Design a protein around this ligand. Structure first.
Ligand SMILES: [Zn+2]
Ligand SMILES: [Zn+2]
Lengths: 307, 185, 135, 374
């Protein structure tokens, strides 16, 4: 199935910047600051002395805009890519992909390295089409390690079933409000994300109340909600969801196109997966892991053209 | 007379029970220790304290070249701290550590202290050259493991690797029925 | 004399020589010597360390036996730089606590005009520090 | 974290070692200990903590894609820090190795015993529930084909219980309590596999020779290529039962099929299956690679017999490096100085009466040498 010269989706998951606050005793908040050195300037960000802990704050929407293509000139390519989402949700369901995205929120995977050397950290979720009594995860390092520990929370059903209904409905919304509480040691190393300079360390910052403050990248944050990809051959580490899925530590592509399991080689078998899903025999684990990865690239968005 | 009994292929205490080839292997090694011709009475007294006279040597050799390091302690190289001991015991005549007891003991006093002292021994720089000497492989198998990155990183003579990286690669990818960790233990 | 380093980490190699000079001023407890870095480039120290006012002492004999040795300005210690690094800004609060720590803050724009560092340690304790040396 | 070593054994599998720790020291199952272990490596800043498995199936260092170097590096820390007296864990792992077999079979290694990669079990590990109650731990022989019977009780190994369900110690603990029935498993006499698995264990059992653990396991790959089928324990005993005249009985019949099917005959055309499938299985120790030395002793007394038939069998430069244990650079070096007599590497200008005399002159060793089969 040849790819058009105009194809594009939008992302269904939309994060925001991360704001760093400092909670003194007497329970008041002040945005965290950092330094700047010249003699090539390197910025250093560490907790002040009298602080008690640290808040973080952002917001994610499961917009569910992966239901139909954003722009697609060929109507045969459009009618196929609509039928996979209606067949994935009927034969497999959004329960496996809703749980893996939501664990990355509900533990601190979006807190990249600031988790390291902490005493305890907690997450509190404020879901929007919701009744009340905000969902709170307490003491994640000891209480929550395995997935089961999340499912023993009193409302883990009721929040996966938002993200499913947000992906199932043609206008589904599901806004979340995440807030963390890191109990560091005294004068702790905190690592924010940092700008790109043509070539020593300049942080990405914003302005919160007339003062500079380090902000985790909006793009930096969605790259940790999307660490789901562990469907590659001989998989050990889960990867960030992408086409021909890279690993930036050891600068190599797993799912290289010579493996046959990058995204574009699975899109060309999109008609092939419609006959497998429309039988009655439940398909193999090898051929639904190809479908979990195929849906995670429509949730990611992008442009899928050729020629 | 202890030596001529031992170099005949026969037993004399405390000198070990080895094959006929591996008793000649100690002789060319021990001449490089004095940096002279062979000395026979100091051969006898050296192995009354085996291995703790060889443990007496490696303590002298790492503690000297750290003092007399010309570069910083992160820019140190394996040939610059232990280029004399490690490169002087590899094939005597082969890498059979069950009979080449020199390198087979040397591995014990290298593996144990790896991550002591901030991982000093485990972070020694190495080439793609001397990576092939330790693994008993060729340069093409190094060049195959930089493409697919089983071995974390081409210039062969530029120091790209670490010693604890090459040491742990031998224990999981490059042993043999003679050159392995499970004879000297 | 004027010592020539001929291989080279001179910055870290010149710094060990002062550790002998650190220890030799406790056996005899003098301070009658001067320190002079002639080739103080704006990048390195240079391969010339010189003592002005050693050559027969225990460290420098074995250094000289191998094929590499030959054996105005104000070179002063500047430990005001040591408090600019932000592990010391919180030591400095616990000093001055003896009150609101939250009304104290950072600087957020600092510009350090050509310091220079040589890393060393203690020998009573197991504790490291920096010999910050400028003109 | 701070633990206790159990009773250490010289035949415990690695998967049994992370159950005898995880039961004793207050964890719920094997999954809980692995999850706790991965976090520990994060706190002491090990490089490959992110590759450490939470599955006990992929705990062995061949299951890693690129992190096999960091899996034993993860294993070289736990034996030094998290215990009182250091346990033996690197002596239990199944590491990879580069020891290629004949023709191209790769190998894995567990300490000082090298196994064929093609003889690894991967579907479901058979076990003996009598060792799972009296010894209570898993013998490492259970991870391999060729080992069908338990050599310590003369009883077969179980793979499917009475309710139609299987059994494995990596998912059902070390007690022996299955899934569907949660009962004791109902058991399932021969001799032909019983004496092989006593020989496959590492004891002395006749008529199978006194080979080492690396070389007792190099023959079971070699015999399955002879019969070209699944492994018959009856014929593998009776093949060695009349050494050397049972081993020669195929040899004198190998030539008679290939003499009829005389100077353009080749060593690959006349003695190609016996020689090329027997060089390294696993290595070239003629004290303990008895297949080559007996065939060489057959062919030393056949060098210049039949008007020098075997002396007139042709070899290349590629397949001469398989014999002489060298590279192609030393072959082209002997053409310039003309020690070996007749460039095209696949040229047929070299004969077997010319190569074997060079190996007795310029290419011996301490193990690949004539000094055993004299
Ligand atoms: Zn049993
Ligand atoms: Zn059962």
């Amino acid at each position: 199935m040849k790819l058009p010269t105009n194809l594009a989706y939008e992302r269904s998951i939309d994060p925001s910047d991360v704001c760093f606050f400092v909670v003194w005793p007497d329970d008041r908040k002040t945005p965290l600051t950092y330094n700047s050195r010249t003699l090539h300037q390197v910025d250093f960000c560490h907790v002040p002395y009298g602080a008690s802990h640290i808040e973080c704050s952002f917001s994610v929407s499961f917009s569910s805009e992966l239901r139909q293509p954003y722009k697609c000139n060929s109507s045969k390519v459009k009618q196929t890519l609509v039928q996979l989402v209606e067949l994935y949700e009927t034969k497999i369901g959004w329960t496996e992909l809703a749980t893996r995205y939501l664990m990355n929120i509900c533990n601190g995977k979006w807190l990249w390295k600031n988790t390291r050397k902490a005493y305890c950290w907690n997450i509190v979720l404020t879901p929007w089409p919701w009744n009340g009594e905000k969902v709170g995860f307490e003491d994640i390092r000891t209480n929550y390690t395995s997935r089961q520990d999340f499912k023993n929370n009193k409302n883990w059903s009721a929040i996966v079933e938002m993200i499913k209904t947000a992906f199932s409905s043609t206008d589904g919304l599901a806004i979340f409000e995440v807030r963390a509480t890191l109990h560091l040691p005294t004068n702790a190393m905190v690592r924010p994300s940092q700008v790109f300079t043509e070539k020593s360390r300049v942080f990405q910052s914003t302005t919160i109340d007339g003062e500079r403050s380090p902000i985790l990248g909006a793009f930096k944050t969605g790259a940790a909600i999307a660490t789901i990809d562990d469907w590659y051959p001989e998989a050990t580490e889960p990867l960030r969801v992408g086409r021909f899925g890279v690993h930036r530590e050891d600068v190599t592509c797993y799912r290289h196109p010579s493996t046959g399991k990058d995204f574009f080689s699975i899109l060309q078998q999109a008609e092939h997966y419609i006959e497998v899903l429309s039988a009655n025999k439940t398909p193999a684990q090898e051929t639904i892991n190809d479908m979990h990865f195929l849906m995670a690239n429509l949730i990611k968005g992008g442009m899928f053209q050729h020629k | 007379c202890t030596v001529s009994n031992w170099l005949a292929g026969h037993e004399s205490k405390p000198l070990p029970n080895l094959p006929k080839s591996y008793r000649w292997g100690l002789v060319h090694w021990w001449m490089g220790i004095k940096d002279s011709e062979f000395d026979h009475f100091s051969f006898v007294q050296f192995f009354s304290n085996w291995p703790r006279s060889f443990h007496s040597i490696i303590e002298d050799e790492v503690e000297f070249n750290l003092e007399h390091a010309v570069v910083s302690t992160s820019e140190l190289r394996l040939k610059d701290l232990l280029g004399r001991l490690f490169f002087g015991s590899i094939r005597l005549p082969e890498r059979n550590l069950q009979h080449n007891i020199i390198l087979g003991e040397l591995l014990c006093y290298l593996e144990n202290r790896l991550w002591q002292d901030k991982g000093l021994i485990a972070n020694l720089k190495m080439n793609a050259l001397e990576a092939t000497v330790m693994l008993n492989c060729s340069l093409d198998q190094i060049a195959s493991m930089v493409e697919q990155r089983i071995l974390k990183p081409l210039d062969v003579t530029d120091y790209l690797f670490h010693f604890g990286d090459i040491f742990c690669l031998w224990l999981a990818e490059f042993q043999s029925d003679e050159f392995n960790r499970s004879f000297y233990v | 004399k004027t010592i020539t380093f001929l291989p080279c980490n001179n910055e870290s190699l010149a710094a060990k020589c002062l550790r002998v000079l650190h220890g030799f001023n406790y056996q005899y407890e003098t301070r009658n010597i001067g320190v002079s870095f002639p080739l103080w480039c704006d990048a390195t120290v240079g391969k010339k360390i010189s003592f002005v006012s050693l050559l027969k002492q225990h460290y420098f004999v074995q250094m000289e036996q191998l094929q590499y040795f030959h054996i105005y300005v104000s070179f002063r210690r500047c430990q005001s730089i040591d408090k600019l690094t932000a592990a010391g800004l919180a030591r400095k609060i616990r000093r001055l606590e003896k009150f609101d720590p939250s009304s104290f803050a950072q600087k957020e724009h600092t510009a350090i005009a050509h310091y220079h560092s040589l890393g060393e340690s203690s020998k009573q304790t197991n504790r490291n520090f920096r010999l910050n040396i400028r003109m | 974290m701070f633990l206790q070593r159990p009773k250490p054994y010289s035949d415990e599998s690695l998967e049994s070692f992370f159950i005898r720790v995880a039961n004793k020291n207050g964890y719920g199952d094997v999954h809980r200990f692995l999850e706790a272990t991965k976090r520990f490596l994060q706190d002491i800043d090990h490089n490959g903590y992110q590759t450490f498995p939470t599955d006990i199936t992929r705990i062995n260092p061949y299951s890693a894609k690129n992190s096999s170097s960091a899996r034993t590096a993860s294993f070289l820390k736990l034996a030094q820090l998290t215990f009182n007296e250091p346990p033996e864990l690197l002596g239990l792992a199944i590491n990879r190795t580069n020891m290629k077999y004949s023709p191209s079979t790769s190998a894995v290694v567990r300490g000082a015993e090298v196994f064929p990669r093609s003889l690894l079990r991967t579907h479901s590990i058979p076990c003996c529930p009598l060792c799972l109650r009296e010894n209570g731990y898993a013998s490492y022989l259970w991870h391999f084909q060729g080992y069908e019977y338990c050599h310590s009780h003369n009883v077969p190994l179980i793979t499917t219980c009475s309710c139609g369900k299987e059994f494995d110690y990596r998912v059902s603990g070390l007690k022996g309590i299955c899934c569907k029935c949660k009962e004791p498993i109902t058991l399932t006499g021969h001799e032909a596999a019983c004496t092989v698995s006593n020989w496959l264990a590492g004891h002395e059992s006749k008529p199978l020779p006194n080979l080492p653990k690396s070389y007792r396991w190099g023959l079971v790959h070699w015999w399955m290529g002879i019969k070209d089928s699944e492994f018959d324990h009856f014929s593998f005993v009776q093949f060695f039962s009349n050494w050397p005249r049972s081993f020669h009985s195929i040899i004198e019949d190998e030539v008679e099929f290939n003499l009829e099917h005389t100077s353009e005959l080749r060593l690959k055309d006349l003695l190609g299956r016996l020689f090329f499938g027997s060089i390294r299985l696993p290595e070239r120790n003629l004290q303990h690679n008895i297949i080559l030395g007996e065939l060489l002793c057959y062919l030393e007394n056949r060098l210049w017999q039949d008007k020098g038939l075997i002396a007139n069998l042709k070899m290349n430069a590629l397949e001469a490096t398989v014999m002489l244990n060298c590279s192609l650079d030393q072959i082209a070096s002997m053409v310039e100085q003309r020690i070996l007599k007749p460039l095209d590497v696949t040229d047929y200008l070299f004969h077997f009466g010319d190569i074997f005399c060079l190996w007795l002159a310029e290419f011996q060793s301490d193990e690949f040498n004539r000094s055993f089969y004299v």
